[PDB]
Structures are given as structure tokens and as C-alpha cells.
Amino acid sequence: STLKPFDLNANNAVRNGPGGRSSIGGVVATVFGANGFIGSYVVNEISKRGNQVVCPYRCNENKVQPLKQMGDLGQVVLLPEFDIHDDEYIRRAISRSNVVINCVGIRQETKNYSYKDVHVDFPTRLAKIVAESGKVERFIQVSEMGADVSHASRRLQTKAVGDEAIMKYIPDATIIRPGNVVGIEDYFYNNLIFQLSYTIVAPVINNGANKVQPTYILDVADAVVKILKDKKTSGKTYYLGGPETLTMRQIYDHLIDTLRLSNDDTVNLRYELAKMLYKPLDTLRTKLPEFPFLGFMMSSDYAEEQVADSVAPAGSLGYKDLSISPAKVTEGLAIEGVRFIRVGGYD
Amino acid sequence: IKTSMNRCIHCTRCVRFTHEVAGTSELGITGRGRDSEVGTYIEKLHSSELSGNVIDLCPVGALLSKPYAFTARSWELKGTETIDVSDALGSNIKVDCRGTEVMRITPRLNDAINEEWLSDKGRFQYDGLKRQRLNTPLVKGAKGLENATWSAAFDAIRTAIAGAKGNELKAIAGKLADAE
Amino acid sequence: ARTNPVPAKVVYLLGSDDFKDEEIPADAFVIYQGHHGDKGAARANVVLPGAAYTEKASLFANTEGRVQTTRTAVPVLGDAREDWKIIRALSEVVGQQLPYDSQPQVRARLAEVAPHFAEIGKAESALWLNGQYFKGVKDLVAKAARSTASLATNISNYYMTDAISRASRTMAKCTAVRQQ
Amino acid sequence: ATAPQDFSLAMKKADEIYSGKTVKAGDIGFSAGVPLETYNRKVRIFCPAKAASQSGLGRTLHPSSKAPQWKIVFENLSKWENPLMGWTSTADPLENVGRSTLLFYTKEEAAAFCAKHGWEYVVDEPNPRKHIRQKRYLGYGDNYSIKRKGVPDLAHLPSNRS
Amino acid sequence: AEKNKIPETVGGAAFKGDLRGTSAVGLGDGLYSHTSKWMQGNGKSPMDYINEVEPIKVKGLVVASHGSDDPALGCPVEYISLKGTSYENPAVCKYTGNRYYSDCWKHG
């Protein structure tokens, strides 16, 4: 195999070394949302190859501790106070950066920030600030597969509107649209397990009919690298679905099987009932702080996004265009994390 | 040539070189006894193009290289034995480097070609190896010569060669081109 | 080429910064391959960076014809490459791939073209064939005319004669000192 | 050139008493356990020439020198500058091993070591140094010889003038 | 301008028009002064300090320079020629940078 350059202008001058931690890569990156699940792996991929990553974070030293190990001396720059509404800080963050990745998103609404702020206002404002600079060459935005303007869920609708705004201001931006991402710190399998084990009943929207294409975090992280190593990818949206399309019922059953749960704890909370149970609780969320007890699963938006098929459109760009073979998320290393919990020879 | 005549032990290597070999006959021991001193009695500058050799001939650092002044110590340098392309003599030299930088160039013994002497141009032209350097492929556009990758430059050369045919293609080799 | 001069449409400069201005027809496509930016690079549509004598292991022949070789004292700078590798890569791009793909194979090709290149470090004697050559070129030497020029050196200033020397600051100071 | 007449005596004697068993070229390199791509590197077997600054003959191949003077050196590879502190960074594992520790008394010893490990090598013999003064200044007496300006012409003598 | 100027020496411990021994540090960054390479501020440089100190008159044609007042707490002992030296063109201690000049050679 032959190392492929990061297709950035004047990279040939600055780049030097084998491509490792101590080598010099000509990529300075401002990854918004670095401390998140998706952002941390992107930071790891970029910094692993000797590049410098600027990580704006909302003040939290313990949350951004893993990012410190990611790179060599002076390569991972952690900016302490990030606000989505502060223009001057955003300009300072992307001052030296030639690529900007936006992974900032909220699964649920709160009193301080709504979907329309984070998923619409921040992309537009950041798009204008990046456009005025000109030094930034590549822009990557991470969105859900099911995001559509004509979507019942407010999260997936606002995300698509923000993506359209980004496309308007920067025409050469690439919209990465992965599916439900499986990982050790993921919110897919971990939430499903917590539902199966520490919840009285596991409500399943409809009968698990909704189809999904889960993908492993390393595959999306590698896909980001392949986007940055090709300039021909610019201006295109890539639907990074997984190798296998599975219904939600199959994933629940297979989690029950791998964990060797005694029996099936899942119940049928059909739609038109969740739309009445969670509808007031959304208004409850918008007027109260972040609470661990209820979140993500316990929302009308989640029920609305679990009544549709979040699958890649037939004619679409994907992993094949990036020359990546996605790994199965129901077998192999991907499933080791749930495997450690219980496999029936365990405890 | 930098001078520290206080460090001068009164050997006559510089005078003998300037007379017998260089043949400019500029340096001599003026004085008698302890206050005897070496150098031009008048203010004169050494004119030979073999002037650098007195620095190597000087055993006690009284004559030193002004370009290579206070820049490095001997133990810090890695020496590689190569040849000088300054002229067709092919003087045998030893290039001393610290890291990625050439720090100094000194001759080597080859009685066949350069006994142990080096011309000033070859000795002190390493300075111009750090300046006006080409680092990246450049392809011309309306905005001028601009950064390009190796593939793009080769593509432009391919489109250019396609037009030309036979003796329309012409090659001019330079002074420093090698056999390969 | 000598019999029927053809206006060049593409000119390849292999480190040639001293070309006569009439050499390039001023509408030609110029490819400059070299390591300093000088008169050659300024007049280039494509510039291909190459290594210098300090950065490459290359063969040079003396005025006595002794074949001597350089070593890589310092690593190559930026996105520059060894010159023979550049030409072979361009040969693959243009559709005429060259047989050699390694430095020893290039040296073997040099040995085939001229056997003495295999004898690195040794000067090979020449058979005295000069008289037969001049007997061969009888008509041409008669064709040659007389010029109103006197036998003299072409080196105006010794310190600057090539691109490396012209870039050197030290050589410029030496030249200014001589010209004052 | 006479004899060191020290521990080197027993050193040489241990050399001549003992010997090594012959093996096929490159077989030991597999026993070494190092990455096999190490032996893809090319080897130059040379003796350093004398530094022009100093007039000592110890480092040269001279009868005075009693130390190993033939080095195995590997070709130079890429080097860069640390972005933070400008330090010289490298990825070459064999950067300084050959210069620092691979010292041999004779060219055949280094060639045997290289062939035993499987390294391809090119041996470069030092340019011969012959301590022969030129005929003009062959001796101290030649400095004040009649060669400088010829035999003194005696046409200036008063007898010859008159 | 500094990009195409020849490195030169002011001449306090050197001559007015000599070459300056220079390494290639700062050549990429674009710095061509000694102090710029290592000091990034706008404060007073040590060269500015040493220039402010004035030459000192001494008697004789040689002065012993120990750098500091106590011989064992400063530079090695140095003997500097005071011949052909004046206030405008003083002799310099290479270790310390102190400047000296004497009128004795003029038979005074």
C-alpha cells in the first residue's frame, strides 16, 4: 500500500515524515464537538497522522482529558470557552485552520438551547465565518441519514435545514451522513442495553419494523480521512450506511441473544400512544435542565424517527465511492463491548 | 578570513603557503622577538582564490573562516566525503552537516587531483544552498507559476509533448547536471 | 538537428540557467528541472524540483575523465526528487517507459554507453585517435571561417559562475570587495 | 608499526587462536531477529579521511594507528524539524549505529560481517597518502639552494667590470 | 530588503564592513537579525544593554580583563592590546563586551 496525500493546497511543501505521530502533516483542523462520541474519533484520526487539531470545547477539563493523549506536543490545541453564539471565538478558532469539521449536535432539547439554535443557527453563522476567511479549504458536516426537510421529528428536520444553509454559503462542503454509529461510547447499543436491563419495561416503537443501517465508528472515522484525502469528494453528500440493513426488532433480539437475557423484556408501545405519552414531556424538557432520568428514548421525536426507515437512498454516494468496506456491527470486534457484559459463560 | 593574532604561534605555514603555493606573497612576519607579528604590514585583503586554505593550514585558530564563525563545534558535525562540482577539477571534499543543514565544506586528500587544496568558491558556496531553493512542482497559469503536485506537472508536460514532434523537442543540459 | 535546424516547440532545461537567449524561441513550452530559481526557472511553464549535489548520489567526470561520485550529505528538501527518477517518472507518464527502475540499473546503462563509467575513481587512458578525426573532418574544418575575437577566458567573475554561487551571499561580498 | 605490547597482544592472540564456523550468507540475519527490511538497506564500507584542520595521523590508516578505522555506514534518510521546537526529527533506526559502533580493523572483516548479515556493500578504498616532498623543497638545504635564482653571476665583480 | 542584504557586522567587536557568520536559523521564518531569532518581544535586548555602557580609560598598552571584579567569579583572564585605541574606537573584551581605550601609545 502507498500512502495517499491529504489533498490540500501546498501540502507537498509542509508535509514531511512517515505519516505518524511525530511526522508533519499539513492539516490544521478545527473540529467542533471534539469531546463528543463522533468528534473524538475524528480528532484521533487527524492527529494520529501528525496533523494539528484545534478542539473548541465548553469548559469541562475532565471531558476533554482523552483528547490530550491524542497527539504529540503542541498538536492538540484545546480552547477552553466555546459558545455557539460567539462570533469572535469562532474566528479565533479557525484562524490557522485549513479544514473545519462540525460535529456539534443535540439529541434532545433543553431550556438554554433548542434544536433550531444548534442545528440551524450555528451551521449558518459558522458557514459565514468560514466563507469570509478563505484559508479554509475543506468543510465537512456530520448529519443523520434520516434527516429530511419533510420529517416529523424536529431534530432530523432542523439538521437538514442547517445542512442546506451550509451548502448555500460554502458550495464545496461535504455532508457526511452516517447511520446509527456503534462504538464503545455510542448512544445506540449502550442505550438499548440500559433499556433492556435497568428499565422496568423496554418499550419498542411499533413492532421494531423500522429498518436501520448501523455502522462502526472506525469506519466513519476512516471515511472522514478518505474525504480529506480526495478533493473530488467536495460538494457531495455521502450516506455512510453499514454493510447490513437490519430491522430494529432484529437488533433487539440479537442484543438479547448476545447478552443472554433470560427472556424478551421488550414490549409493544405502538405509535399514536407514544405521541400522547411523550408529547407533554417535550414541553417538560424545554423548561427544565439536563436530567439523566429521562432523555433521547423518552421523546416524541424519537418515536417519530422510529416509525420511518432510516436507510440510504438507492442512488447515493457511500462507502464504496470512498473504497472502504464497512465492518459488520453484529459480529466481530464491533460487538465485543456488549459481549463483555454477558455471553452465558460469563456470570 | 577572520583574524585572532593573539592565538598565533609563530609557525610560518601561512607565509610559506602565500609565497610558495598561492603566490600572492602578501603575508610575512614583521617584527623581531616576542612582538613579531604575522600579516600584511599595510591594510591589505588576501586576493588569491586559494585564500581559504590558510585557515586549514593554521594549527591554532589564529586564521579562521568568517562565514563559518561561531556557528558550530567540530563534534556536532557529520562528515560525508563527496566531490566539488564547482569546476571540472572535481576536487575531493568533506561536507560537514548538522541535521538537515550543511555547515562547512573542507578538502580531502587526493594527490591525483586536488593535493589537499580547495578553491574559495567551492569552500564557501554552501551558503547559497539555503537560498532561492525550489521545493515544489510549479505549473504556470494566468496568475503565474503556482504550486502543483507531481502528477499535475507531469500531465501538463504530457499535453505539451503531445504537440511537439521530432526535433521540435529540445534539451539543454546545465553545468551541474549529472551523468544519470 | 545540425543539418536542418527546427524551431523548438518544447525545451527541457536540465539545470541550465546559463542558456543563450536565442536557444528558446520565446514561444516554446519550457520545462525547467533544477534546484535553484534563476534565469531558467523564471522562463519556465513547468518547474520540476530536483536535488542538489549535496542531496544526491551522482556521477561526474573530470577534465581528466576520472569518474567520481557524490554522496547524500543532507536529505532532499520539500517535494523534490532525484533527477533521474523525475525523468523516468515523466517517461512513464508520457507513454515511453524507460527500462531502468533503480540506481544500479542506471549505472549499468552508463557502463554500457561508456565502459569507463564502471571504473569509478580510476582515470582511463585514451587511444590517440585525434589525427584520424581531423583527417575525417577535412571538409568541415575548411568550412569553418575566421572570427574577429581574441583567445581569452569566458569567466568574467570567478566567484559567481553558476546558480549556487549566484545565490551565495558570501560570494557576493567577495565580488563587491574585488570591485571597489 | 612495531608492536603495541599491551592488552592488544592478548586481544590479537585470542583472535588467532579462535575462529568462527562458516554459514551461508544472510542466514545469521534471520537469527538476529531484527526487521528483515533492515538488510534491504545498502552498506558503504570506508575508512574516514584525515580532517584538514588537524595534522594528526591517528584517524587515518597509518602504521601509527592501532585502532579499528573501517566503518560500516548506512545511507542517509529523511530528516525534518519538530514543528513545536525545531528539533531534528528522524524515522531512521540505523542512523547512528554504524558510525558509532561498527568499527573494523580490516576491509575484509567488515565485508564478512555484511555478507554474514546479508547487507549489500560497496567497499571504498581510501585515497593513498604518500609522504613524498617535492623536488624543489625536498630538504631544508633546498630552501637556500642556487635553484632560487641560478648561480650568482660574477659579471658584477670589479675585475670583470674593468 | 533584509531578504537580499548581505549579513554585515556593525563593528563594535568586529570591523564595520565584514561578513557576519550566520547559520540558517530563522531563514524560513524570515528573521535575519540575531536577537529576532531568539527574542519575540519588544523589550530591550542585551546588545542594547552592552552598547549603553561606555568605554573606560586605562593606563598602559595592555589591560587585564577578568570580566567581573573578582577573578574567579567571571570570565577567564584576558590581555587586550590598547594600542591604536580611542574613545570612538575602543578595544573590546570578547567574553564580557566591555570597552577599553588608552592614550599611552600617543606618548601621554
Binding site: 503542541g74 | 507559476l145 503556482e146 | - | - | 519575540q40
Partner: peptide, 28 residues
């Protein structure tokens, strides 16, 4: 957050410790 190396992102004039000057192509 007072002292950082001169090659740091925080440094006002960040330093690339390159020891070679690069030719600048002529305009147009």
C-alpha cells in the same frame, strides 16, 4: 497560560523552523 514554545498555536507569530529560504515565483 503564559509561557508556550514559539512553535505553539498560541504564539502570535508562530514559527516554522525551516532553515532554507524558498524561491518566490515572479508575478504574472
Amino acid at each position: 497560560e503564559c509561557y508556550n514554545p514559539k512553535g505553539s498555536w498560541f504564539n502570535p507569530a508562530k514559527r516554522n523552523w525551516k532553515k532554507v529560504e524558498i524561491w518566490q515565483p515572479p508575478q504574472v
